[PDB]
Design a binder for this molecule. Structure first.
Ligand SMILES: C[C@@H]1C[C@H]2[C@@H]3CCC4=CC(=O)C=C[C@]4(C)[C@@]3(F)[C@@H](O)C[C@]2(C)[C@@]1(O)C(=O)CO
Lengths: 10, 253
């Protein structure tokens, strides 16, 4: 769903 | 002539805000439809920089991951619009929106058909920073507060920590004001004024998101958004439209 935001935040 | 060296960090939140603040992005048109797409493409890059910035803010990464994602989704437009107001205010060259050093929108372009109604809201921030003569330190504190200004109605998973973090930056804004060396009475008045300006950002943002969401959704309008922005907006809308976004206010209103 929020793969990009999640990736950036990890 | 001095040697190469990094400036001295001190044990204060504002000294850290200053070091972690991203550098201004360069963008790298006389039709509103084209201008809009260009602004969005810049915006997506500025938002990626903003996510990296938020992860450096003392306390942020200690919040539950869902909390972090929600705060960013709820506040990105506010952070982007406030920074746009700042760059425009610091240009001191009149009513001009300074999206990037190589992308300025002057009075002539701001009045193109379809542009004024959206540019006027962005310009409002600039004229307010100018009217209050906001200092860089005050601006950094206020900008951090915008990241912590819109929450889910049901509360965050890390609510207690969030409340502590928020109070930390409210005090830091107070320290930035005090530092200007006004008297006690001026300090009280200024805290009132800057918190009123923070509250007024909620209304500004409501005007901007209206354009953001409609232009994003109406695929027939052929206004493009980069991937990152598209994903955020896609997730934000449901929360926004369901009335889940609670605006924290300093003043009753
Ligand atoms: C009126 C809205 C608010 C506009 C945004 C206001 C905040 C901002 C500041 C910037 O430095 C770069 C992009 C953004 C983040 C923006 F300017 C572009 O995205 C286009 C934007 C969404 C808008 O013009 C659009 O809806 C056009 O599609």
């Amino acid at each position: 769903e929020n793969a990009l935001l999640r990736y950036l935040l990890d | 002539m001095v040697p190469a060296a990094l400036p001295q960090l001190t044990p204060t939140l504002v000294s850290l805000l200053e070091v972690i603040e991203p550098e201004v992005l360069y963008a790298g048109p006389d039709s509103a439809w084209r201008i809009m797409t260009t602004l969005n493409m810049l915006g997506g890059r500025q938002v990626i920089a903003a996510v990296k910035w938020a992860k450096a803010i003392p306390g942020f990464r200690n919040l539950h991951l869902d909390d972090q994602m929600t705060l960013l989704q709820y506040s990105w437009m506010s952070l982007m619009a406030f920074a746009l107001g700042w760059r425009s205010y610091r240009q001191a060259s009149g009513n001009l929106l300074c999206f990037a050093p190589d992308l300025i929108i002057n009075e002539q372009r701001m009045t193109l058909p379809c542009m004024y109604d959206q540019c006027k809201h962005m310009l409002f921030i600039s004229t307010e920073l100018q009217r209050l003569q906001v200092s860089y330190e005050e601006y950094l504190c206020m900008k951090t507060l915008l990241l912590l200004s819109s929450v889910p109605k049901e509360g965050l998973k890390s609510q207690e920590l969030f409340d502590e973090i928020r109070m930390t930056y409210i005090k830091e804004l107070g320290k930035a004001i005090v530092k200007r060396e006004g008297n006690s009475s001026q300090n009280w008045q200024r805290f009132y004024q800057l918190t009123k300006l923070l509250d007024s950002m909620h209304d500004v943002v409501e005007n901007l998101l209206s354009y953001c969401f409609q232009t994003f959704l109406d695929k027939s309008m052929s206004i493009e958004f980069p991937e990152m922005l598209a994903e955020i907006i896609t997730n934000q809308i449901p929360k926004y439209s369901n009335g889940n976004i609670k605006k924290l206010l300093f003043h009753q209103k």
